[PDB]
């Protein structure tokens, strides 16, 4: 079985921003970066195991990369996916 | 395709000299005809696309021999 | 520094006939 290490790989990092802080303090939701595919079921399962918390629902979105102008060369940032994980009344982190 | 299934005759291109020797590209077609040959080995009729010359060689040589040669060539009748 | 690509058709001349 490889569901285990898959859950250890779908999370990538947490997202920090004033919207992220506002969501956490008001709606008790934490926004974090996830893998490219990172289906909602996998994100929910990963949050359950790693953070030993309970989640109401997970809704994701895909953030398109920006086109940046470095020197005399053009380049595009890599796309990534962020998920708004919603916790129940009881939360830890 | 206009290809004899026995002798392998195929259309061949060629010129048609006129009275003033003028040349135009033509094409000689084989005298193919769809014929139904009776074979006693299978006790049935087999339809083939053959030319006038092809029907003569079938008439002379055994029908079975032509079929056996045709099978060896790998063409499906 | 591209040389002019589209040159318009010249204006029709006055008929000297």
């Amino acid at each position: 079985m490889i569901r285990e290490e898959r859950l250890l790989k779908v999370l990538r990092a947490p997202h920090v921003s004033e919207k992220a802080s506002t969501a956490m303090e008001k709606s008790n939701t934490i926004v974090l970066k996830v893998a490219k595919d990172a289906t909602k079921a996998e994100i929910k399962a990963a949050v359950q195991k790693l953070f030993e918390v309970e989640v109401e629902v997970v809704n994701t979105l895909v953030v398109k990369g920006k086109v940046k102008r470095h020197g005399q060369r053009i380049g595009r940032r890599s796309d990534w996916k962020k998920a708004y994980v919603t916790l129940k009344e009881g939360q830890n982190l | 395709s206009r290809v004899c299934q026995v002798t392998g005759k195929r259309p061949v291109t060629g010129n048609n000299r006129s009275h003033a020797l003028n040349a135009t590209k033509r094409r000689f077609l084989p005298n193919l005809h769809s014929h139904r040959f009776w074979v006693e080995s299978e006790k049935r009729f087999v339809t083939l696309r053959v030319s006038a010359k092809g029907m003569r060689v079938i008439d002379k040589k055994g029908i079975d021999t032509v079929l056996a040669e045709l099978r060896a060539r790998g063409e499906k009748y | 520094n591209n040389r002019p690509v589209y040159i318009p058709r010249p204006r029709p001349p006055h008929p000297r006939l």
Binding site: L8, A13, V16 | - | -
Partner: protein
């Protein structure tokens, strides 16, 4: 360390592969993202270790 686990059985070597991913791999990535990971060479070391363990599993298991 490369031959230290070469003489390990599948079960125990599979376990340490599990531990390498669960601890020191997920936790390190969170620290690096949050910015409290002063030393980054751990991420390189752990990733190579996971690869080294993983190849032995394939080399041992099956062929």
């Amino acid at each position: 360390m490369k031959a230290k686990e070469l003489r390990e059985k599948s079960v125990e070597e599979l376990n340490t592969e599990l531990l390498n991913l669960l601890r020191e791999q997920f936790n390190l990535r969170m620290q690096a993202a949050s910015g409290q990971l002063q030393q980054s060479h751990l991420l390189k070391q752990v990733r190579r270790d996971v690869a080294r363990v993983k190849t032995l599993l394939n080399e041992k298991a099956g062929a």
